[PDB]
């Protein structure tokens, strides 16, 4: 019986956390900051996709180029395999 008896502990959420209070502050820095910095330089993330939208396969490719050199053998291989698969799936398998 997947459904349960004890209803959960109350999910407390401060909507005025230091994160949420200042979410989006400085974001939009170009159009009112003499274009010193692009908003794409605000974002913090994995280097291979920083201000770059991409696609599944494309992302993989980017990762392989940007980072692959300094990537863990067990994971690099996996990445390569993924790329191989992904190309096949896109360039051949689907509809239209």
């Amino acid at each position: 019986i997947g459904i349960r008896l004890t209803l959960p502990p109350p999910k407390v959420v401060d909507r005025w956390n230091e994160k949420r209070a200042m979410f989006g502050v400085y974001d939009n820095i170009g159009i009112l900051g003499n274009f010193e910095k692009h908003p794409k330089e605000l974002i913090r993330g994995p280097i291979w996709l920083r201000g770059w939208k991409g696609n599944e396969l494309q992302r993989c490719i980017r990762k392989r180029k940007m980072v692959g050199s300094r990537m863990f053998a067990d994971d690099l291989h996996n990445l390569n395999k993924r790329i191989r698969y992904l190309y096949k799936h896109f360039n051949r398998h689907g509809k239209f």
């Binding site: 051949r92 398998h93 689907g94 509809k95």
Partner: protein, 287 residues
């Protein structure tokens, strides 16, 4: 506004209010349910439903339409074709009217670019502007123009108005520099000497009947006269009018820019222009 007034009523516009305009966001058709599940838009067995359908163009083993036709040089040497973005006289006139592009100064490519009449792009092998006949009549400029090709009619039009059409040549590299000079400056190299016509453009720019910058200026007046004879109207003598001093300036070649020599290094921050000295370097620049 009425809308603003209305907004005095209604609640404060919060994140809990907001909604995208109808039509902007389409519903997402995903395949769970009796309408969109079961065969799920794929059909029945075969090579459709399994994916695996053969490539685009293939015609089931009949020779493909694209392969059945014979080859032919339509796009044979297209990356080695010179491509000239056209500027119609009408456009030029409009620009003049609007204030951007000042006819009291010379009209070089750079000026035009700044104005944003003619956008051009060295990648995709543009070799500059070509002056075109489109606003032949209904034109009134009286201006000198450095332009990379010119129709005869266009030339005539300008001349009748008391202007000076001079054609000029910008190598792809030179052209790039011309188009956006500030980025070149930022890059930090010395302003290079532009190269000459390659081989088959040399006979163009050495003739005075298309106002070539290497053509002998003794024949220019003759050419002008000839033009006048053909298309009616009288040549306005240039020497008498007040702007002659500016109309005489001719961008003496391997210079790129109208004031700056080849070999100048333009320091933008802390505004100076560094010049080369050193005899050999100077000689090279001259060459």
């Amino acid at each position: 506004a009425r809308a603003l007034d209305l907004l005095r009523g209604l609640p404060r516009v919060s994140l809990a209010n907001l909604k995208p305009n109808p039509g902007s966001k389409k519903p997402e058709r995903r395949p769970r349910g009796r309408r969109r599940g079961r065969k799920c838009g794929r059909g029945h067995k075969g090579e459709r439903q399994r994916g695996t359908r053969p490539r685009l163009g293939f015609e089931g083993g009949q020779t493909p339409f694209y392969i059945r036709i014979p080859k032919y040089g339509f796009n044979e040497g297209h990356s080695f074709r010179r491509q000239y973005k056209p500027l119609s006289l009408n456009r030029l006139q409009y620009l003049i009217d609007l204030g951007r592009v000042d006819p009291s100064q010379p009209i070089d490519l750079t000026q035009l670019v700044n104005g944003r009449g003619v956008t051009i792009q060295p990648l995709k092998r543009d070799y500059g502007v070509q002056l075109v006949e489109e606003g032949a009549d209904t034109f009134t400029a009286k201006v000198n123009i450095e332009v990379q090709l010119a129709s005869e009619l266009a030339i005539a039009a300008i001349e009748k108005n008391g202007g000076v059409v001079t054609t000029a040549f910008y190598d792809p590299r030179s052209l790039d520099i011309v188009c956006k000079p500030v980025p070149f400056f930022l890059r930090g190299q010395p302003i290079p000497k532009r190269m000459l016509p390659p081989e088959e453009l040399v006979p163009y720019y050495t003739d005075a009947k298309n106002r070539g910058y290497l053509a002998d200026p003794a024949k220019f007046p003759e050419a002008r006269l000839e033009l006048a004879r053909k298309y009616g109207y009288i040549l306005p003598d240039i020497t008498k009018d007040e702007l002659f001093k500016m109309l005489c300036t001719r961008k003496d070649p391997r210079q790129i820019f109208f004031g700056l020599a080849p070999g100048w290094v333009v320091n933008m921050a802390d505004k100076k222009i560094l010049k080369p000295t050193d005899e050999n370097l100077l000689k090279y620049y001259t060459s």
